[PDB]
Structure 1
């Protein structure tokens, strides 16, 4: 019970990667950053709305909903090259 199947896509190139539970954002992010060699951002798109992965809270919510949905199987994540977005602070709460 520890092998999540995640599908990553970069510039049209798709790849199949498995992650043994518990799946941590640090482990996943560290792998993506090393493979591509850059701080890429993960975007979780459900269908109608888009969620940005900033912390574990975002990933935890995404996995919780995905697991709840028996219909769903793989994870749809979009990789983007967003290394430092200008010199400022963006906080909303």
Structure 2
């Protein structure tokens, strides 16, 4: 429930703002299909996109899933930040990424 409370708190603060190896393991989530793929450091963003396209056969958006640290990964920088977050966490063992289609 730890992850749950932390989510519900995130949702609350968001709505209340209505108007005022050392390989990186990425857990991919696409229509209930978990897929864990490891990436060696240094992890390149375009290679991750490349991997998604191959494995899942269609262009998918990467939604980094971490309550108020969640973000649409659009660039090397975004990814490195997610990777850093995971490095400094005591509980997380993988980067969680929800896959959605842009259209």
TM-score, reference length from structure 2? 0.71
Q: Does the 8 A contact of 1:2 with 1:19 survive in 2?
A: no
Q: CA RMSD in A?
A: 1.6
Larger proportion of strand: 1
| Matched residue, 1:58 | 78
- Secondary structure at the residue paired with 1:48? helix
Structure 2: runs of 5+ lacking an equivalent: 1-20
Structure 1: runs of 5+ lacking an equivalent: 84-93
Q: Report the structure number with the largest CA radius of gyration.
A: 2
Larger proportion of helix: 2
Instruction: Measure the CA separation in 2 of the matches of 1:54 and 1:3.
Output: 21
Q: 1:42-85 CA distances to partner (integer Å, 9 max, x unpaired)?
A: 001212453111111111111111111132211110001115xx
Instruction: Measure the CA separation in 1 of the matches of 2:99 and 2:80.
Output: 18
Q: Does the 8 A contact of 2:27 with 2:36 survive in 1?
A: yes
Equivalenced residue count is 83
Q: 1:7 aligns with which of 22, 27, 52?
A: 27
Runs (4+) of structure 1 moved beyond 6 Å? none
Q: Does the 8 A contact of 1:41 with 1:79 survive in 2?
A: yes
